[PDB]
Design a protein around this ligand. Sequence first.
Ligand SMILES: CC(C)(C)NC(=O)[C@@H](c1cccnc1)N(C(=O)c1ccco1)c1ccc(C(C)(C)C)cc1
Ligand SMILES: CC(C)(C)NC(=O)[C@@H](c1cccnc1)N(C(=O)c1ccco1)c1ccc(C(C)(C)C)cc1
Lengths: 305, 305
Amino acid sequence: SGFRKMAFPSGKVEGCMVQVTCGTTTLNGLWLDDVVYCPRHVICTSEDMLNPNYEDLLIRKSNHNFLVQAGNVQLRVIGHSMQNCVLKLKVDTANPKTPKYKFVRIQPGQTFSVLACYNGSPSGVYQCAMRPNFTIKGSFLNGSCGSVGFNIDYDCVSFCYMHHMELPTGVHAGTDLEGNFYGPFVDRQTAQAAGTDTTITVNVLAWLYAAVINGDRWFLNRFTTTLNDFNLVAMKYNYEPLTQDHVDILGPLSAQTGIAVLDMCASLKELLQNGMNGRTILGSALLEDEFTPFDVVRQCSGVTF
Amino acid sequence: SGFRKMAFPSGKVEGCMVQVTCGTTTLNGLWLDDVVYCPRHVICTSEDMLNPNYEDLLIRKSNHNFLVQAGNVQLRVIGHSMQNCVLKLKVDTANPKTPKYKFVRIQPGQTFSVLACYNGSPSGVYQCAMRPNFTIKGSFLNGSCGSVGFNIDYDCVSFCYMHHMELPTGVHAGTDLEGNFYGPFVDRQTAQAAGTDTTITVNVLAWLYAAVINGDRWFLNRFTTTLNDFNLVAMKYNYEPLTQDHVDILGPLSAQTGIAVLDMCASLKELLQNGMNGRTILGSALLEDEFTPFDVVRQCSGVTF
Ligand SMILES: CC(C)(C)NC(=O)[C@@H](c1cccnc1)N(C(=O)c1ccco1)c1ccc(C(C)(C)C)cc1
Ligand SMILES: CC(C)(C)NC(=O)[C@@H](c1cccnc1)N(C(=O)c1ccco1)c1ccc(C(C)(C)C)cc1
């Protein structure tokens, strides 16, 4: 029993973390096969980051300008190119610790583990979700750029995030491993703001099914509701609209707990309208939305990797 | 910027996780050098766990009754002994992935990372604290016994916990790597209850210093208080008494933020007496106490391993 915010084992990712320096700027890179992936803004200078022209800046850089370090071993960069907002440095040696991996672009509301790194060395791992406004509420300090977020499927690592920027509000922005930013953000020092950060409703529901599975049932009320009526209250509290797919995604937890999805929606509705009256659910005083239906199943079943 | 509940990279611990079976009971073991550590209750049967006499039960077991599996490779048990509530199976091969390690018994209020495992395979990692009642609020399912909690010091792993039991309330109990239970709990199926779970006050203070460092300052009031007066309110809300050592431990955060410790105590006092009025601190609606002063420094500075 018990429900903690939990991340994948990071061993497989640790073996791919290297350091990348260009000029005076140092950050983290991802070393898979004979290619190192890192954010392109490594080539910028503090003055050039107001309006960087990466095409022109990259022209002044040669292979020998990119300093890559795996542990204390230097890698020979024999090629460099730019794919969207990420650099690809080709090295002479393939990473012997390269695991089975894949590059996937996740959807807003999905989760992943982040291995925060500094100078190509891991410092910690935690769990994030892709907010509906395409930011993440990470824990990143300077130099954390180049750290990656990932999911694990038994033996295969699915990379989905690489950190780039911190937004003025304190949130964080980045791209997938193909260099495409999640959201409308760009790698420049300019006024950028994220939209409204709604609540991932389906994730909250899975969290409530998690609570019921762990003994917290005080919030289970006696009503039920309609998917349309529930939505009328969700979209007033800045909640994501629930779809039939969400109801289907939640089916497994509905069958395990024996509580129809629409009944839990009614419980959630009364929680939103009346608050929690100072009580707690799974040790939290807020409605957590950073657990997907799959994460709940994984943690309440025991899926190992 | 940003503050998430974060754990150490688990790669070094992953390479020590093996599976241990005795009879029909399977659980996890820790493989360091040529010894495997696992809870002694692996030798119990479902009937014998009401009042297990481990001395007599262990007498009926030989080396070849303990089945240890590292990956899909079997290890030859050439010796077995009992140290407190943990078994030590001596194997013929030393663990090639054995890192620099140490066995430490942590103090209540301290934190550590847990690598939840099932059948000798890691499933996830999260951060825990040793509650003042000597339980932990883990996420453990059946078979999770034998998983370990640890801290990392650059390159040295300090093991401090090994999971044994789930208590009737839903909390969890275990021992250090020498087999000594944290708290007054015993490895039997009997009526056991933990005492009052107080709040680790010093950890809450470091969390508030963490918030101030991340931009959340709304709770900073205009008063100050005395260490004795603050305690009179803490011990009414079931908070740990603050000592001068706690004030000294918090010195670094007090100097960084420029807020004397006793002033933050006054802020905490008004939060306890009046609640948070539906606001949040670092994304939480409750006062978090599972971050030590050291964890806050590590996360707000960038200490890598
Ligand atoms: C908020 C801002 C002023 C832009 N500071 C940062 O983004 C920090 C940073 C700080 C904390 C977490 N992640 C990045 N930041 C860095 O820390 C950094 C840059 C290179 C290695 O580490 C950073 C990220 C992107 C840029 C440009 C404008 C060139 C794309 C410049 C600096
Ligand atoms: C609450 C209780 C009825 C005792 N169930 C468990 O403790 C589960 C268990 C379940 C969830 C998390 N950790 C342990 N539990 C186990 O899951 C387990 C035992 C062996 C391998 O996995 C367990 C722990 C200790 C004992 C004795 C009494 C022999 C010391 C028996 C079973």
